[PDB]
């Protein structure tokens, strides 16, 4: 059967850089219980597999970012890492693609559940997450469509939709090419069979689907975290017209998402060494370390300084718990210590001197309130640059 539900809507309270307020939808439990039981197995199996396209649940510490970056270059021919971003991804995704996502995630229970069972499950998910009865400020409303960001299957559904837009742009760019000027004798045949298998046929063609997918994985390697992509496309092709390009993504978003992705936000790096310009909001540098070269992620310094200087609660403003709230900031800001720009070199030692001063004033106040202190010595290991330098090595 089906069970409509009500989902609230709350304003968020957190640092940012644009004066718009972002909302989040907290779905009602009677839906999360069932969705959890239905998807948990597949989801906990996606978040624990290293070395595949969908990279969720792979830390950047302990030599994880370097392994991501060296997997992406799965032996493509003339790399040119690119990117993109969808505008208003959460409020324009058409209903059809959300339904395709839910179907592809429900394509595993080929034997746990029967067919009518799968259909009522999908109808239930549609009426609970897709087109629900939002309750925004003491008064119900009706959502026209578009995903919501508080259910169970959110980041994975986004990853699926993302791969779908990428492959669609790829198909369009391969078809639209003239065809009589493609010099090679293989890819032209490939197009000539693609069109026929697309429109002049009705049933699956597993052999050809396999050939096309291998062609992709050899000229369009990806890396996807729910909408943040990085591609490593062969370049001679992409110039002859045989894989995607930012122009093609603009087109596909123009007739399937119904927005316009201006090319001022699609960075395109042409030197393979220096890594992706910006992925998941962490620029990437190449730093020598231990006789071999590794990639390191480093944040945007203004963000670290802001997160130290402005706190959301009044009790977080004293250096009682800060002696701990600062270790984490310093851990995230370590890689700046190998940057060549000097202020990027200093936003580390700032935190590092501040921790020491904090701890010294702490022992002062404590040895005043009583007169003794026994074994709070281990804190002599947070203000040395060795403990953190351990955190970006590959042993563990």
């Amino acid at each position: 059967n089906v069970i409509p539900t009500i989902t609230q809507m709350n304003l968020k309270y957190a640092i940012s850089a644009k004066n718009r307020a972002r909302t989040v939808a907290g779905v009602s439990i009677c839906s999360t219980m069932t969705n959890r039981q239905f998807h948990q197995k597949l989801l906990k199996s996606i978040a624990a597999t290293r070395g595949a396209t969908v990279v969720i649940g792979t830390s950047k510490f302990y030599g994880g970012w370097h392994n991501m970056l060296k997997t992406v270059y799965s032996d493509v021919e003339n790399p040119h890492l690119m990117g993109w971003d969808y505008p208003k991804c959460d409020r324009a995704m058409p209903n059809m693609l959300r339904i395709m996502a839910s179907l592809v995630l429900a394509r595993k229970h080929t034997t746990c559940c029967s067919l009518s069972h799968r259909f009522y499950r999908l109808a239930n998910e549609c009426a609970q997450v897709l087109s629900e009865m939002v309750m925004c400020g003491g008064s119900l409303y009706v959502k026209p469509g578009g995903t919501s960001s508080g259910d169970a299957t959110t980041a994975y559904a986004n990853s699926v939709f993302n791969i779908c837009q990428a492959v669609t742009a790829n198909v369009n760019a391969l078809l639209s090419t003239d065809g009589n000027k493609i010099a090679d004798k293989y890819v032209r045949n490939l197009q000539h069979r693609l069109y026929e298998c697309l429109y002049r046929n009705r049933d699956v063609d597993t052999d050809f689907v396999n050939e096309f997918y291998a062609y992709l994985r050899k000229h369009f390697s990806m890396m996807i975290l729910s909408d943040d992509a990085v591609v490593c496309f062969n370049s001679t092709y992409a110039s002859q017209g045989l894989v995607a390009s930012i122009k093609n993504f603009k087109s596909v978003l123009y007739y399937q998402n119904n927005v316009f992705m201006s090319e001022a936000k699609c960075w395109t790096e042409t030197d393979l060494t220096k890594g992706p310009h910006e992925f998941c909001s962490q620029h990437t540098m190449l730093v020598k370390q231990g006789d071999d070269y590794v990639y390191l992620p480093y944040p945007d310094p203004s963000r670290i300084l802001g997160a130290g200087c402005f706190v959301d609660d009044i009790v977080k403003t004293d250096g009682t718990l800060m002696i701990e709230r600062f270790v984490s900031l310093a851990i995230d800001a370590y890689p700046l210590t190998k940057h060549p720009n000097q202020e990027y070199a200093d936003v580390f030692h700032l935190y590092l001197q501040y921790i020491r001063k904090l701890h010294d004033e702490l022992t002062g106040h404590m040895l005043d309130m009583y007169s003794v202190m026994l074994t709070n010595d281990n804190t002599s290991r947070y203000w040395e640059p060795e403990f953190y330098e351990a955190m970006y090595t590959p042993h563990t």
């Binding site: 005043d368 309130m369 009583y370 007169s371």
Partner: protein
């Protein structure tokens, strides 16, 4: 569980258990309070009695800090330290209390029984913090004395308002006036339970008395009336605000010529606006409160509060104010008290009226432009602290 040394204003974590109010004492201050006075009960974040089961060494001078738990000499842990040592007592912030020589006076105020003029004449002239402490402890002492006298019982049932009372033979009897109310406990065996509050009045003949209870309960022979308790809260605000002068008038706005029949007082009506606080001595039967209402006119829109100690006095003055002011005036005196009755004019709780007439017991905690206490000859340092605490105004004038 910290506070300020009532003598040295440092942070301390101790209190005197034997002293009646248990005030915060700096380390050396408590050492001196405990060395030469019989008071030997000092409470830290936990009490200082030896935690050995059945060990009752309670003199702080005979204990030892053990590991986690203090103890007595016989039950002491293997290693520990003496508590009272080198003129100090081990307390939180041990090193950073200053400690002072106000020890003799504090000892006196702590041990005295107030039965001689020394305590009054001394509390009248000591230090402000010490003054307030003496006031609170005197209140609590007289309150505890209230407990000394005895209970009343019934002897014979006659009617609904004519009863014969029986005093517990051998104890001080209470004065039969409206200012005494008692809870009525009836003992079945098996449900010793209160019946309500009661007050008496000696009629034209004994031992018959006419009385009023808050409830219409049927009085049996198994009933009796026990005095109803009262406590004391601590106060912090000053008694007399430090005096200040100026060269202009601020917050108050003059008038041109209104009410010429209040003429001679204008010369003083200005200096009040010039100074922070002042007083008027009015010989018996003089033009006092005439000056009050006259200044109230002189500064019309300046919000004013009147207060006194006597309910009869505040009633008389609120009536006199009703005589000459726009009304447009409230006397929020008492809703359900004041056995001798008073105003039945306006609100008790709205905090809106310009000229608020109130009594110390029922003062709210609001602000105003000027407040005037009256009849200073009766109120005490405590009452002064309350009237300076609850309110806060620009200028203060006392008349008495």
């Amino acid at each position: 569980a910290v506070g300020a040394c009532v003598l040295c204003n440092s942070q301390t974590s101790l209190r005197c258990g034997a002293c009646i109010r248990r005030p915060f004492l700096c380390c050396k201050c408590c050492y001196d309070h405990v060395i030469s006075t019989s008071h030997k009960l000092v409470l830290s974040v936990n009490p200082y009695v030896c935690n050995a089961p059945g060990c009752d060494v309670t003199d702080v001078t005979q204990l030892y800090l053990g590991g986690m738990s203090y103890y007595c000499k016989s039950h002491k842990p293997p290693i520990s330290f003496p508590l009272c040592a080198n003129g100090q007592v081990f307390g939180l912030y041990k090193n950073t209390c200053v400690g002072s020589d106000n020890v003799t006076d504090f000892n006196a105020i702590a041990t005295c029984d107030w039965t001689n003029a020394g305590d009054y004449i001394l509390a009248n002239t000591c230090t402000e913090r010490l003054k307030l402490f003496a006031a609170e402890t005197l209140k609590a002492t007289e309150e505890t004395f209230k407990l000394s006298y005895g209970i009343a019982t019934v002897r014979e049932v006659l009617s609904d308002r004519e009863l014969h009372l029986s005093w517990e033979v051998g104890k001080p009897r209470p004065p039969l006036n409206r200012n005494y109310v008692f809870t009525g406990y009836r003992v079945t065996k098996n449900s010793k339970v209160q019946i309500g509050e009661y007050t008496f009045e000696k009629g034209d003949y004994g031992d018959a008395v006419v009385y009023r209870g808050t409830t219409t309960y049927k009085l049996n022979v198994g009933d009796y009336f026990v005095l109803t308790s009262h406590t004391v809260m601590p106060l912090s605000a000053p008694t007399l605000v430090p005096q200040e002068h100026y060269v202009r008038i601020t917050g108050l706005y003059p008038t041109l010529n209104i009410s010429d029949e209040f003429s001679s007082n204008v010369a003083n009506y200005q200096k009040v606006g010039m100074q922070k606080y002042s007083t008027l001595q009015g010989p018996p039967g003089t033009g006092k409160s005439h000056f009050a209402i006259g200044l109230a006119l002189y500064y019309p829109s300046a919000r004013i509060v009147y207060t006194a100690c006597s309910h009869a006095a505040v009633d008389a003055l609120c009536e006199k104010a009703l005589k000459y002011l726009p009304i447009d005036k409230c006397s929020r005196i008492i809703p359900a008290r004041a056995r001798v009755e008073c105003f039945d004019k306006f609100k008790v709780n709205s905090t809106l009226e310009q000229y608020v007439f109130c009594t110390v017991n029922a003062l709210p905690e609001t602000t105003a432009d000027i407040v005037v206490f009256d009849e200073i000859s009766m109120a005490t340092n405590y009452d002064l602290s309350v009237v300076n605490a609850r309110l806060r105004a620009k200028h203060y004038v006392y008349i008495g």
